[PDB]
């Protein structure tokens, strides 16, 4: 069946019938700073070559028009000394534009028109250099790759903790670098029909993450199983343990947000768990172990799971049995 957002974190829902009013290009550089590296490098070299060829053509033409291009000895001084053909003119254009300044061909004080073309060439060169540096730097603050290094366990299990049904999922870090003030927004989607006859195709509802006195966020050093307790007030509380594996369509997504240390940008990661991915009545294997003088974490058992003799029943019926026991 159709998934809401894919495991890799990319969004699945394909958009249709966007009334484009042009804002897609109106974000001129915040559009292309999104692109890949080959496309952005291609369009940067094309910017540079476009400008260089434009001014090389205009210079070729101005040297042709002054008549300094006509090879002649005396009665003149070329506006640009030692210019012969188009090739040397393009060499002059790249010599003055990108500010190497070879000086074999000298622009002279006889023609003020060449002064004007230089005084606009250089400023446009400097402006396009300034933007083509700022945008590549604004790019190198792409830290979604740091959204790649995070990992979640492939499937999530539920258990019985403290006499109440609980669901456990793992997270973890993959580098030394921490993520500041990460917060968890844990959401459930379902095609819902209201008592008013209103049917929604998809209905996001927050399920709380259960920490100390409150709080939406967590602290990530070692793999920490996130711990929620479904109660009669919770939206997930009504389902049955035998109807989840095959038929029902329930996506439980988690969105972890946080700002990486060194860049300072705020990244996040998104993952979905389907009704066929989740399973019932198990327990993860303890990862952390007291090694020689530290805590060793073994990621081989990250996705490992052991059987646990826990009663199998619906959370509504389990709450009724708790009322009975």
């Amino acid at each position: 069946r159709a998934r809401f957002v894919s495991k890799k974190g990319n969004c699945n829902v394909a958009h249709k019938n966007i009334r484009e009013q042009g804002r897609f290009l109106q974000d001129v550089f915040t559009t292309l700073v999104d692109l890949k590296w080959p496309h952005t490098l291609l369009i940067f070299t094309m910017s540079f070559l476009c400008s260089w060829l434009l001014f090389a053509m205009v210079w070729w033409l101005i040297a042709f028009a002054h008549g300094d291009l006509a090879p002649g000895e005396g009665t003149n001084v070329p506006c640009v000394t030692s210019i012969h053909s188009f090739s040397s003119a393009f060499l002059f254009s790249i010599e003055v534009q990108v500010t190497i300044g070879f000086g074999g061909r000298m622009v002279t004080e006889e023609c003020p028109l060449a002064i004007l073309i230089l005084i606009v060439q250089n400023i446009v060169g400097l402006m396009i250099n300034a933007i083509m540096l700022g945008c590549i730097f604004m790019k190198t603050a792409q830290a979604h790759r740091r959204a790649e290094t995070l990992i979640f366990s492939k499937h999530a299990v539920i258990t019985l903790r403290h006499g109440r049904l609980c669901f456990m999922l793992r997270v973890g870090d993959l580098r030394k670098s921490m993520i500041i003030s990460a917060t968890i927004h844990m959401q459930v989607v379902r095609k819902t029909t209201s008592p008013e006859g209103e049917v929604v195709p998809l209905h996001q509802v927050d399920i709380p993450m259960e920490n100390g006195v409150g709080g939406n966020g967590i602290f990530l050093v070692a793999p920490l199983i996130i711990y929620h307790v479904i109660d009669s007030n919770s939206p997930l509380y009504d389902l049955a343990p035998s109807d989840l594996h095959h038929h029902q369509d329930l996506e439980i997504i988690v969105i972890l947000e946080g700002v990486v240390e060194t860049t300072g940008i705020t990244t996040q990661a998104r993952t979905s768990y389907l009704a066929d991915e989740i399973l019932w009545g198990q327990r993860f294997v303890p990862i952390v172990a007291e090694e020689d003088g530290r805590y060793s974490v073994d990621y081989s058992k990250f996705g490992n799971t052991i059987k646990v003799p826990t009663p199998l029943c619906t959370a509504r019926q389990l709450d009724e049995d708790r009322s009975l026991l």
Binding site: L25, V28, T31, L32, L35, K36, H39, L42, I43, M46, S47, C50, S51, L53, L54, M57, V58, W60, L61, F64, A65
Partner: peptide, 27 residues
């Protein structure tokens, strides 16, 4: 030849402005 070059110029101007936008739209 001078007028030929003067004609070549504007085509070049347009072909050079088209490539950034065309490459953003194609990317």
């Amino acid at each position: 030849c001078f007028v030929d070059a003067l004609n070549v110029v504007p085509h070049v101007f347009l072909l050079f402005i088209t490539f950034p936008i065309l490459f953003i739209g194609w990317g």
